[PDB]
Amino acid sequence: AEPEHDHRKRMGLKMLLMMGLLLPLVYAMKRHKWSVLKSRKLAYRPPK
Amino acid sequence: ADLTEYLSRHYKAPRMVLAAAGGLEHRQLLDLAQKHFSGLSGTYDEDAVPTLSPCRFTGSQICHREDGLPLAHVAIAVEGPGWAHPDNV
């Protein structure tokens, strides 16, 4: 009923390993770019 | 007192240059220097001598938004080498 049984699991192992690598790396790339905004500081200086 | 403390610490002979350009002779300039700047302090003291520490440069941005002004002014720069560097040419 499922001749692809063993192959999908071997692939699934590779998918999990690749995601274990790519997810935190892309997340690191996301935080790198966003750091410009996350640490930005604002100040309001109206005339008075 | 802030002013004298500042002057005390910075206006010293070794940190000054009497310069002149024009129709004059160096010898007369020097004779006048000896005559008028001889008493100029050449020593603040041992626990003195104002010395500059390096100034860190930071890639960064400062934006003062004011839509009420008619034109925008923008200044952008990377860190340069410093006076004495040959690269300045």
Report the candidate in B17, B18, B5, B2 with the shortest Cα–Cα distance to residue B44: B5
Residue among B64, B60, B73, B70 at smallest CA distance from A44: B64
Domain locations in chain A as residue ranges: 4-48
CA A3 to chain centre: 34
Structural resolution in Å: 2.1
Return the H-helix or E-strand segment holding B6: helix B2-10
Q: Does domain A4-48 have CATH number 2.60.120.380?
A: no
**Of residues B60, B66, B63, the one with CA closest to residue A42:** B63
Phi, psi (deg, nearest 5) at residue A32:
-60, -60
Q: Quote the tokens at residue B34.
A: 């000896």
What are the contacts of B39-45 at 24+ separation with CB within 8 A? Answer: B40/B12, B40/B13, B40/B16, B41/B11, B41/B12, B41/B13, B42/B12, B42/B13, B42/B14, B43/B12, B44/B8, B44/B9, B44/B12
Gap between the Cα atoms of B34 and B40, Å rounded? 10
